[PDB]
């Protein structure tokens, strides 16, 4: 099933949707990075979306400390897999994670060949 | 808890999000209509979004027959409730429901004061 | 400027884009209605987007009085003429206009088969 | 036309809009990078959006060669100057350009504090 660096009560979740087919975007590769002290993007977690277009178990709460994170979504592979030429090489979401703010982070991405929209839902409850 | 005309294995679900606060849009009124024989919008189901920004139990499968449906979202009340002047009177989603197509319908709406995006996810599994 | 029904400084303009092809949505039919005293939609103006995906000259400043307007974009025909059976019947934007004096409104829509985004840009004329 | 680094027919243009105020996003800093032979991002061009939310003259057609480019929009500064702590650090659009000959690219972004949409309009020059 879905997983990542550390499957636990998801502090970070990714949901990807397909605006052309009206369906979840399945088997889409997602790579998470953490900005290191030297400003380089340290690999953090990675995975592929499930049949429901979701990626959970990426990280556990112990290791999800405040910092700058980058979620890279391989949208090009996805569109190539459907016979459609896309515009973007990938879609990235860069944000800061702070403790004062709600605990859970859901990054949602809605995809089209020449356009993508992303939203963040920060909460306290589950999902 | 959440409900509507007939709470069952949700053939139709609504999910509303707030792009300004990064949270689900709670207590948002949603009215569903069915185009009648005389082309008027017959009231069909209605409700308010839950704490998770979702509305389920709107209809049951027996009564969700092929037809043209309209989902009206009272976005103006929502923004007025936050001290923000919105542009739209409401957001409507009009679509045809056909049996050949997947069984489940999830209408998602992402809201901002002067802009809204809506997507449909049509599937066979749950959600 | 252009009184009667022309377009003084063009108070109402529509811009449609295609998220699947990365281009303006050409020849999209647009119908505008104004809410009449009797609470019914009265035909106000109509046209089709140009090669640039824009629609100008829908109304003159003199006739564009305060009121509730509905801009209906025939998205279904557009996608069908491309061989795609889309989800929505059309896209509708309903808003109150000119309540605090005359303004210039630009309604933009970004189209995908199972999704659409709309935003409004409201300017205060200066000439 | 304008060779060197000006803008012949303006091959690269950025348009930024604000979904919370219903207006162009003025004075937004934009940085463009090109992927160098060594797989590192090299500074290619930069500027700020005008009162219309547009950024023109970033490059000339002669210097806008085939390559992978990254358009970085400083969304964080924009929202902060408005008193809002937004979710994202910035918005980045990465794409391959001019691989099948020269084209005109228009990168559009619609901004909200916890969300952004981006689309591309690619035109084939004729003059």
Curated annotation (Swiss-Prot), chains A, B, C, D:
Effect on the protein of changing residue 42 to G: In AMYLD1; amyloid polyneuropathy
Gene3D superfamilies membership: Transthyretin/hydroxyisourate hydrolase domain
A GO cellular component annotation in the UniProt record: extracellular exosome
Molecular-function GO terms, alphabetical: hormone activity; hormone binding; identical protein binding; molecular sequestering activity; protein-containing complex binding
Reported impact of residue 119 to M: In Chicago variant
PTM annotation, UniProt: Not glycosylated under normal conditions. Following unfolding, caused for example by variant AMYLD1 'Gly-38', the cryptic Asn-98 site is exposed and glycosylated by STT3B-containing OST complex, leading to its degradation by the ER-associated degradation (ERAD) pathway. Sulfonation of the reactive cysteine Cys-10 enhances the stability of the native conformation of TTR, avoiding misassembly of the protein leading to amyloid formation.
Keywords in alphabetical order: Amyloid, Amyloidosis, Cytoplasm, Disease variant, Gamma-carboxyglutamic acid, Glycoprotein, Hormone, Neuropathy, Phosphoprotein, Secreted, Signal, Sulfation, Thyroid hormone, Transport
Result of changing residue 55 to P: In AMYLD1; amyloid polyneuropathy
Protein name per Swiss-Prot or TrEMBL: Transthyretin
Source taxonomy: Eukaryota, Metazoa, Chordata, Craniata, Vertebrata
């Amino acid at each position: 099933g879905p997983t990542g660096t550390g499957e636990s009560k998801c502090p970070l979740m990714v949901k990807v949707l397909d605006a052309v087919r009206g369906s979840p975007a399945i088997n889409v590769a997602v790579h998470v990075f953490r900005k290191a002290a030297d400003d380089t993007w340290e690999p953090f977690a990675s995975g592929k979306t499930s049949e429901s277009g979701e990626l959970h178990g990426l990280t556990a709460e112990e290791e999800f400390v405040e910092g700058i994170y980058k979620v890279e979504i391989d949208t090009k592979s996805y569109w190539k897999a459907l016979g459609i030429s896309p515009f973007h090489e990938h879609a990235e979401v860069v944000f800061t994670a702070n403790d004062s703010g709600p605990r859970r982070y859901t990054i949602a991405a809605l995809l089209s060949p020449y356009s993508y929209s992303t939203t963040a839902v920060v909460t306290n409850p589950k999902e």
